[PDB]
Amino acid sequence: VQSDTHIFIIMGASGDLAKKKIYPTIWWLFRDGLLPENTFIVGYARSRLTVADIRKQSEPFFKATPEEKLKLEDFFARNSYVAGQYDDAASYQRLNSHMNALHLGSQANRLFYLALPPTVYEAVTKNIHESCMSQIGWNRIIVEKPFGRDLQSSDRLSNHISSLFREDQIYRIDHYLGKEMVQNLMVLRFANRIFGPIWNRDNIACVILTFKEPFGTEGRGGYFDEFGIIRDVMQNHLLQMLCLVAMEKPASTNSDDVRDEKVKVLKCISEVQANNVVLGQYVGNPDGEGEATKGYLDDPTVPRGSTTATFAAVVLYVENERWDGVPFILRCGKALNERKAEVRLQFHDVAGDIFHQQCKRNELVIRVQPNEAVYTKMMTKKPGMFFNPEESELDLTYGNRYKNVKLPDAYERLILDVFCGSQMHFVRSDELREAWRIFTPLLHQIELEKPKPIPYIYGSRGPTEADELMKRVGFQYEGTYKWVNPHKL
Amino acid sequence: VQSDTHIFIIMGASGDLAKKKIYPTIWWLFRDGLLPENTFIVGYARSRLTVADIRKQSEPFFKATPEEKLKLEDFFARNSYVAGQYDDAASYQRLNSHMNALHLGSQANRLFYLALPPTVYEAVTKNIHESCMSQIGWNRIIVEKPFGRDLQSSDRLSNHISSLFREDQIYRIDHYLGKEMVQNLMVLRFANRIFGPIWNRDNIACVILTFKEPFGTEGRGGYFDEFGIIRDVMQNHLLQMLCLVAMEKPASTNSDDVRDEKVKVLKCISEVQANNVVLGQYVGNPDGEGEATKGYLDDPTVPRGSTTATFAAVVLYVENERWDGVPFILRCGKALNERKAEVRLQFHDVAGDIFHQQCKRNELVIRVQPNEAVYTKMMTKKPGMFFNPEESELDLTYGNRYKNVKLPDAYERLILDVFCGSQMHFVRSDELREAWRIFTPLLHQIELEKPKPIPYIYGSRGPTEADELMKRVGFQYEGTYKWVNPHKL
Ligand SMILES: NC(=O)c1ccc[n+]([C@@H]2O[C@H](COP(=O)([O-])OP(=O)(O)OC[C@H]3O[C@@H](n4cnc5c(N)ncnc54)[C@H](OP(=O)(O)O)[C@@H]3O)[C@@H](O)[C@H]2O)c1
Numbered sequence: 001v002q003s004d005t006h007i008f009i010i011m012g013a014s015g016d017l018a019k020k021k022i023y024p025t026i027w028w029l030f031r032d033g034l035l036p037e038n039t040f041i042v043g044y045a046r047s048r049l050t051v052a053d054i055r056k057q058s059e060p061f062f063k064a065t066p067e068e069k070l071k072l073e074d075f076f077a078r079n080s081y082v083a084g085q086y087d088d089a090a091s092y093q094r095l096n097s098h099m100n101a102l103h104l105g106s107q108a109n110r111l112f113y114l115a116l117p118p119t120v121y122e123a124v125t126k127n128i129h130e131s132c133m134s135q136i137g138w139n140r141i142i143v144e145k146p147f148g149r150d151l152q153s154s155d156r157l158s159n160h161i162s163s164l165f166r167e168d169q170i171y172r173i174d175h176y177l178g179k180e181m182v183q184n185l186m187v188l189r190f191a192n193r194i195f196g197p198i199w200n201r202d203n204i205a206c207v208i209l210t211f212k213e214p215f216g217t218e219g220r221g222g223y224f225d226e227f228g229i230i231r232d233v234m235q236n237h238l239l240q241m242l243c244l245v246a247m248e249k250p251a252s253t254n255s256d257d258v259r260d261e262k263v264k265v266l267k268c269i270s271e272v273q274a275n276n277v278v279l280g281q282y283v284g285n286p287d288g289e290g291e292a293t294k295g296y297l298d299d300p301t302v303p304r305g306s307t308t309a310t311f312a313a314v315v316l317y318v319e320n321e322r323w324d325g326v327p328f329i330l331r332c333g334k335a336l337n338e339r340k341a342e343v344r345l346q347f348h349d350v351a352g353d354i355f356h357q358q359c360k361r362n363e364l365v366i367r368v369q370p371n372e373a374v375y376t377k378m379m380t381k382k383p384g385m386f387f388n389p390e391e392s393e394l395d396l397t398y399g400n401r402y403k404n405v406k407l408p409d410a411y412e413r414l415i416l417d418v419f420c421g422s423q424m425h426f427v428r429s430d431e432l433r434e435a436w437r438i439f440t441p442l443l444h445q446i447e448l449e450k451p452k453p454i455p456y457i458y459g460s461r462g463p464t465e466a467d468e469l470m471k472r473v474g475f476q477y478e479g480t481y482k483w484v485n486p487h488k489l
Numbered sequence: 490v491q492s493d494t495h496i497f498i499i500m501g502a503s504g505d506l507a508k509k510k511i512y513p514t515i516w517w518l519f520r521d522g523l524l525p526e527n528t529f530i531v532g533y534a535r536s537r538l539t540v541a542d543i544r545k546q547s548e549p550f551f552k553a554t555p556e557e558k559l560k561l562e563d564f565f566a567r568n569s570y571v572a573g574q575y576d577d578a579a580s581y582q583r584l585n586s587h588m589n590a591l592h593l594g595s596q597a598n599r600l601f602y603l604a605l606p607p608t609v610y611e612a613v614t615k616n617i618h619e620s621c622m623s624q625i626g627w628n629r630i631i632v633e634k635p636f637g638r639d640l641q642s643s644d645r646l647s648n649h650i651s652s653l654f655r656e657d658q659i660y661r662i663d664h665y666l667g668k669e670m671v672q673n674l675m676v677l678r679f680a681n682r683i684f685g686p687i688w689n690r691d692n693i694a695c696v697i698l699t700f701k702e703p704f705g706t707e708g709r710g711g712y713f714d715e716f717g718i719i720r721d722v723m724q725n726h727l728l729q730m731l732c733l734v735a736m737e738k739p740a741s742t743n744s745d746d747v748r749d750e751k752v753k754v755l756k757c758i759s760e761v762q763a764n765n766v767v768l769g770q771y772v773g774n775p776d777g778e779g780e781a782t783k784g785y786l787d788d789p790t791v792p793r794g795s796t797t798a799t800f801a802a803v804v805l806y807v808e809n810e811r812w813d814g815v816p817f818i819l820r821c822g823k824a825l826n827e828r829k830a831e832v833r834l835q836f837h838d839v840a841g842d843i844f845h846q847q848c849k850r851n852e853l854v855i856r857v858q859p860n861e862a863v864y865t866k867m868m869t870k871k872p873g874m875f876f877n878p879e880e881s882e883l884d885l886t887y888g889n890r891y892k893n894v895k896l897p898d899a900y901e902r903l904i905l906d907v908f909c910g911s912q913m914h915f916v917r918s919d920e921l922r923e924a925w926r927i928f929t930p931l932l933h934q935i936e937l938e939k940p941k942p943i944p945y946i947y948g949s950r951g952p953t954e955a956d957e958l959m960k961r962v963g964f965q966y967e968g969t970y971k972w973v974n975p976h977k978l
Pocket residue numbers: 012013014015016017018045046047114115116117118119120144145146
């Protein structure tokens with residue numbers, strides 16, 4: 001019967017993430033009535049803008065409709081901008097008195113989004129806690145990757161922030177956690193007797209965690225050159241997915257227990273081993289149709305003779321009862337053959353074969369994107385006047401089963417969570433350090449040795465070696481699976 | 490490099506099963522090149538017909554095409570008819586010398602199909618063994634239900650035939666064994682790690698085996714009145730399906746081991762208990778659209794005041810390690826709400842619930858007919874801005890996944906088996922007696938007590954009581970499952 005004032009402070013407001021993703025996202029939650037009734041958006045950046053510029057530059061990303069006119073007017077009335085520098089005490093004084101001057105702004109819950117480069121993280125978090133914290137409502141900070149470049153460097157930042165804010169005030173973002181299917185992992189796993197007594201090392205051969213993009217560096221490879229693919233996609237997104245697949249059942253669905261089960265899994269993995277690694281970097285394709293005839297080193301923005309790899313495949317192992325000996329294959333790449341983020345389980349051969357080496361390993365597949373789907377590869381009998389078993393599947397395809405239902409962006413989910421104080425889809429500090437300690441020794445190693453990557457053509461599935469690493473750990477491919485979309489249901 | 494002569498003797502040739510199903514079936518195997526090159530069809534009946542009459546009365550069931558003209562000419566050239574009585578020694582002498590006069594007819598393998606009423610079974614099997622058996626090739630007899638009316642009466646016949654023929658010469662028919670999906674049970678179960686470690690009493694709540702027809706007695710209820718629904722559909726088809734679901738993994742896929750695993754299951758079931766039974770007999774529907782306004786007792790062919798039931802539901806139990814305490818619900822009926830033959834597994838609730846009593850029991854469904862399909866009911870998460878788990882499914886629907894593929898009749902499968910000497914889809918003598926010993930005490934009981942059936946309207950799902958019996962043993966229904974066929978795959 002009574003609602004508190006809320007203030008969404010967009011720091012670094014003037015940037016592209018803010019104009020292309022943050023502003024447009026907070027409108028959508030506003031538009032769809034998902035935010036608290038008394039909500040105010042506050043922009044903070046060094047540039048000297050007016051709510052009119054902020055609107056003019058973002059409104060083209062809002063995807064607005066004419067019937068939304070009023071809502072839009074009211075969304076902008078609840079908007080304000082405060083110019084200032086990121087480490088100027090005076091500046092943070094203006095921003096603070098700016099919020100208390102807001103309807104019940106002294107009691108309001110304050111949410112600070114850091115739509116800024118990593119180089120201000122310390123100055124900003126310091127200044128916020130010092131002068132911009134509400135003495136009444138709650139204060140939650142949202143942060144973006146990168147969170148350090150290795151253990152040691154992620155430790156500095158991590159302990160700086162932890163020195164000012166408690167875990168319950170820190171929201172580290174891995175947008176994969178805001179993904180529909182990635183969130184469905186826990187429902188598939190702990191809601192189904194059918195997917196439970198089978199989630200062990202007695203039944204699973206290997207686990208594969210893939211992420212592919214069909215595009216190369218695309219202009220700005222000079223930025224990628226500095227961090228790489230491991231730090232980019234493997235050390236977080238893929239590793240996050242590993243945690244959700246290998247995690248023990250939580251005491252509950254809450255942040256505490258969920259995230260406790262994840263780091264617990266992580267603390268059981270050893271520093272990735274070089275023999276369990278394959279790095280690639282794409283060359284172009286002379287038969288390619290344009291933009292894909294240029295390879296990594298064909299980006300005049302990328303340093304000449306760059307040894308950086310745009311593709312990596314790694315094999316990890318969870319040294320625990322459930323997953324002892326089951327290899328977890330982390331596989332990501334650019335300039336590949338398609339866009340696809342995926343989780344696959346390949347189960348072990350059945351014991352006591354009675355179909356003459358005709359059966360193939362079962363496989364549960366959770367496709368995160370595109371085209372959300374979950375499907376099992378199982379053995380059925382060749383339909384008709386045949387008795388020989390053949391491969392088929394039991395399928396669940398969003399886009400057909402749930403056409404009406406409209407699916408939100410990971411950022412819409414994640415930002416709503418913050419307002420509601422749910423933290424299960426945000427990276428904990430310990431979860432963070434376990435992740436860096438696993439991949440650091442390797443990253444450093446690549447940094448001191450110029451292991452020249454494995455050439456692979458803009459479009460392929462990567463280096464042949466990557467498939468040989470999978471096969472070697474237990475993953476067997478046959479190429480016999482035949483699939484045909486449907487018709488006339 | 491060398492092929493033996495084969496003779497398909499159709500006894501009782503002149504009948505409807507022979508004209509509507511046997512003649513038309515053997516042509517189809519002929520047409521599709523499935524039979525041995527030197528194959529001859531021999532018709533034997535009391536009526537005095539010519540291969541021309543046999544053709545004229547059956548050809549309208551052949552589903553022939555104009556391009557099949559030659560094949561048809563050759564199929565009829567390989568046809569002959571021999572008139573005779575069923576117990577006249579002279580008659581069997583003509584029939585025998587008739588076959589040796591056939592190209593290598595003294596060495597030919599002889600297949601005798603008993604397209605006759607049960608009342609000649611003794612006279613015919615006796616006479617066949619006495620005078621019509623090949624001293625060189627093999628002799629296999631095919632028999633149709635009914636095989637007795639109870640244990641004692643099925644025992645007489647069974648030991649009469651067993652006195653003349655060895656098990657390897659006896660092919661008892663349950664056409665369900667010739668059904669695509671019924672045959673797929675063993676591939677689903679023993680080819681899939683996903684459907685194996687879950688097939689126990691620790692994971693399964695109950696098993697349901699349904700068979701429905703949307704039609705009533707339809708004219709000839711005077712025939713049904715004599716045998717009932719239990720003897721008709723339950724004591725064989727449903728019970729056969731029970732065996733395939735509850736059966737241990739066989740040492741091999743061969744007749745010996747497969748059928749050994751089935752009777753083994755049967756010898757672990759106790760005489761069905763009256764408290765575990767619900768009988769119904771349909772009344773009509775005044776709102777019904779014609780033919781379904783008349784009930785069972787509205788068939789002037791059915792005895793006035795018939796207590797016979799046209800619907801029964803029974804609960805059995807396999808007293809063995811795997812299925813201890815799991816009720817097997819056998820459910821069949823007429824004048825019901827649809828045509829459907831089905832196998833369902835309802836699994837047990839998950840242990841350590843973390844979704845607040847929101848989860849529902851998983852269910853694996855194998856639909857034998859119509860529209861061949863296998864689908865699992867599992868818990869997925871409400872797509873979109875929701876976290877509450879909801880029911881969905883992983884589906885396999887023949888008709889969409891395998892449209893091209895053309896599916897044969899159970900009789901096409903079963904007859905081919907006989908030619909090839911495979912017996913796994915034919916009822917063994919012991920398998921037979923175990924089945925009668927389970928249902929006999931009940932059948933008799935119904936025979937001495939006029940338990941008036943449970944009235945139910947032509948169209949419903951049966952008597953409400955039937956659902957109350959299921960619920961009482963463990964099967965829980967909720968009515969929350971929502972399903973929508975597809976589009977735009
Ligand atoms: N978009 C991405 O791919 C992406 C992806 C994931 C996470 N994020 C995180 O969210 C941030 C999004 O912001 P952005 O990507 O849009 O960065 P950005 O464009 O470089 O700058 C964002 C804002 O910060 C200020 N700024 C930039 N460089 C600065 C510098 N060297 N010194 C002082 N102020 C500086 C600019 O405002 P003033 O000129 O007014 O100072 C600008 O309005 C990223 O840094 C990233 O960490 C981004």
